[PDB]
Amino acid sequence: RYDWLKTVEPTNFLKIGLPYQAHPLHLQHQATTPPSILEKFKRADILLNEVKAEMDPLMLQPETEKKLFQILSSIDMFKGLRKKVEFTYNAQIVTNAWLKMYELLNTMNFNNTSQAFCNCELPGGFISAINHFNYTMMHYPTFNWVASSLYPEDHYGLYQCNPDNWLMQSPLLKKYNNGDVTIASNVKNLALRATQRLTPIHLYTADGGINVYNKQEELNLKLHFGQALTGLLSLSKGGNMILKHYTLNHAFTLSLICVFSHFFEELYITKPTSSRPTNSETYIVGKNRLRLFTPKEEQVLLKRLEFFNDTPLVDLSLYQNLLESVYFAVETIHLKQQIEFLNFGMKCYRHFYNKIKLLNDYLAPKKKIFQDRWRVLNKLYVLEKKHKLKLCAS
């Protein structure tokens, strides 16, 4: 039977709340003995990489490599939704970043989305989604925003047409901020520029990621640490935050969420449905910033980034409550949902590597059900022309 195909259900928005930390934040100066729960997080890393490694045999030959990627395309239930959203509602730059940001705004109930700093942003899905949301949903009289990104990629001309808004610089001005957020001076400067050009900043987002599958979190630690530092250097009190992450298993990643827990009224690890359930992408969301860094906290963290190493930022043993809730996040998102969708894909591969139109025929009705549900859950209205962003490419 192909009844397993017939019984597929939509996924849900997965949202795991985290406890805010009462005690004063003490930025660690010395390596400390790891809490026992880190051994649990390391078990999660090994197993998730075990299921990820299952596709290794198919990658060796280019022939099966192509069938594998066809199969993975075939089982993406949202494939047609970008083009649909784009035509129906005059939405611009409707990449997958657009859907993910739009779903985040419709679900997380932010107090304000009106003064946006979007870092590591190009091609520009996040700013566009927020621009669409702010004009059709929130009706802010005018929406000011700044952005930055590592210099190229601008696919829609959002950078070239809005030089007022972008804080990165061209290689011509190699004198200088190229937008690389792994560089400490670039981070402090990026935050300085954003606060000068636009204040308060009510919403910070960062959507960066290197790629090439076992060290993806390890390889992205420095990029994300600066992603975080940029936002936490610029975000006004009462502001909100959205950071893209991956597997959340490294003790530095866990130490970093521990820092977050001191600065927002609420904190949630999320996986929106428009984020592919087969990958490890996650979104750390903080609502309502309680306080800014103290001058010492600025110095310590920026030095941390300047001479980087994977020692935890804090004493993890002081966050037993928070680490358990993070583990519940990994279990739900990674060990349960992601592993299930990888097994589903391999099963689809084994029964349909040679029957691609057939697998697409079965899932066609389910794809329409899923994409319609998304549109029902995150209501969209048409974006008036006078509020489109000025683009420089088609």
Side-chain angles (χ1 to χ4, degrees):
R1 217 52 171 174
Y2 292 158
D3 162 85
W4 47 287
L5 286 178
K6 303 222 181 193
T7 57
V8 278
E9 311 142 35
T11 58
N12 301 313
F13 198 97
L14 300 177
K15 169 181 39 138
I16 301 93
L18 301 191
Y20 154 78
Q21 231 54 51
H23 311 103
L25 163 64
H26 172 38
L27 282 191
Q28 204 41 46
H29 296 80
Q30 316 138 272
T32 161
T33 304
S36 34
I37 201 178
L38 261 168
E39 202 50 49
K40 229 177 201 221
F41 284 98
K42 182 168 213 153
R43 277 172 244 147
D45 207 85
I46 311 173
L47 168 70
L48 190 48
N49 277 319
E50 286 172 359
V51 194
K52 278 178 166 170
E54 288 198 63
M55 309 182 156
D56 286 0
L58 311 182
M59 299 267 93
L60 301 160
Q61 271 321 85
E63 185 262 284
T64 66
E65 214 250 345
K66 190 206 37 143
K67 260 167 209 212
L68 177 66
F69 283 136
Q70 292 166 272
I71 281 275
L72 264 39
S73 173
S74 300
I75 71 155
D76 168 17
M77 296 325 245
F78 283 2
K79 190 162 178 169
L81 175 72
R82 274 166 52 196
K83 253 46 163 303
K84 207 264 185 300
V85 166
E86 198 216 315
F87 305 152
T88 313
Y89 309 97
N90 306 340
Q92 323 176 273
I93 321 159
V94 192
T95 69
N96 207 57
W98 193 104
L99 304 172
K100 278 180 305 210
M101 179 78 262
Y102 199 74
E103 181 172 8
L104 272 163
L105 298 158
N106 276 268
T107 303
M108 300 310 304
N109 183 30
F110 290 109
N111 61 345
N112 201 350
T113 65
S114 75
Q115 298 273 107
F117 182 15
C118 296
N119 197 17
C120 301
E121 186 46 50
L122 278 176
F126 280 10
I127 330 169
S128 179
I130 294 170
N131 184 76
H132 201 121
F133 191 75
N134 277 352
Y135 279 124
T136 77
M137 276 319 227
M138 296 297 276
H139 300 122
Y140 292 104
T142 165
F143 161 59
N144 317 295
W145 62 268
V146 294
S148 158
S149 202
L150 183 53
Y151 195 92
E153 156 58 34
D154 196 14
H155 304 310
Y156 299 71
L158 168 72
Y159 164 68
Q160 195 204 306
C161 258
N162 303 275
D164 256 34
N165 314 81
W166 288 88
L167 321 164
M168 24 166 296
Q169 264 99 69
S170 309
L172 310 181
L173 269 290
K174 207 150 66 166
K175 86 175 188 235
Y176 177 50
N177 196 335
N178 71 344
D180 178 9
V181 302
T182 64
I183 301 292
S185 96
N186 277 13
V187 152
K188 177 129 207 94
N189 179 255
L190 271 195
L192 221 83
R193 275 226 189 92
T195 52
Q196 278 160 28
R197 264 137 163 260
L198 165 91
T199 284
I201 303 192
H202 288 133
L203 173 61
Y204 173 86
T205 71
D207 209 37
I210 301 142
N211 208 17
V212 66
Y213 47 97
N214 326 85
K215 331 191 168 142
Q216 181 187 42
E217 173 181 356
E218 206 167 23
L219 282 150
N220 273 277
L221 294 182
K222 219 198 177 180
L223 169 59
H224 291 158
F225 184 36
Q227 265 197 171
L229 253 178
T230 305
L232 282 188
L233 281 195
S234 35
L235 194 73
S236 288
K237 198 180 282 84
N240 311 281
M241 179 195 78
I242 301 156
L243 328 164
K244 182 183 135 322
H245 260 71
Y246 294 120
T247 30
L248 304 191
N249 295 314
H250 201 293
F252 184 83
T253 295
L254 297 165
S255 74
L256 178 59
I257 299 152
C258 283
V259 186
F260 297 159
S261 62
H262 291 267
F263 294 106
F264 298 93
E265 187 177 49
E266 331 200 66
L267 194 64
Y268 301 93
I269 291 142
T270 77
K271 176 112 185 163
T273 63
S274 41
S275 187
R276 284 320 110 231
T278 37
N279 72 53
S280 287
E281 189 180 45
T282 49
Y283 283 97
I284 297 161
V285 171
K287 302 185 35 192
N288 189 29
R289 203 199 165 139
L290 305 166
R291 50 167 278 261
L292 305 177
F293 283 147
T294 86
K296 189 64 151 193
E297 298 182 343
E298 277 230 357
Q299 312 150 18
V300 191
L301 284 162
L302 272 181
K303 218 214 208 163
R304 213 69 164 67
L305 172 62
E306 177 174 341
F307 316 97
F308 189 86
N309 63 55
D310 58 2
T311 303
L313 302 158
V314 299
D315 191 0
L316 285 165
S317 63
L318 306 174
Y319 302 86
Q320 180 58 45
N321 248 330
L322 167 81
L323 294 169
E324 267 158 46
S325 317
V326 177
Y327 186 74
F328 184 69
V330 160
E331 220 197 35
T332 302
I333 305 174
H334 293 127
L335 306 174
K336 269 224 82 186
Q337 180 158 267
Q338 179 174 20
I339 284 182
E340 277 156 7
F341 267 96
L342 290 169
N343 289 326
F344 174 81
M346 281 300 297
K347 181 164 183 164
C348 287
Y349 181 91
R350 291 191 307 276
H351 294 79
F352 293 99
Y353 63 105
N354 81 278
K355 331 190 145 153
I356 278 289
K357 186 60 183 302
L358 205 46
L359 189 143
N360 289 314
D361 273 357
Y362 285 96
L363 296 182
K366 274 326 177 44
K367 274 174 197 190
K368 178 208 200 40
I369 282 139
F370 291 18
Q371 288 163 48
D372 287 4
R373 172 145 217 270
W374 190 92
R375 271 151 46 209
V376 155
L377 286 173
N378 314 280
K379 266 149 211 308
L380 284 129
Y381 313 85
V382 182
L383 178 68
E384 282 180 19
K385 204 238 163 223
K386 67 168 128 171
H387 291 315
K388 295 222 199 173
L389 296 150
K390 195 186 190 207
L391 310 157
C392 263
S394 295

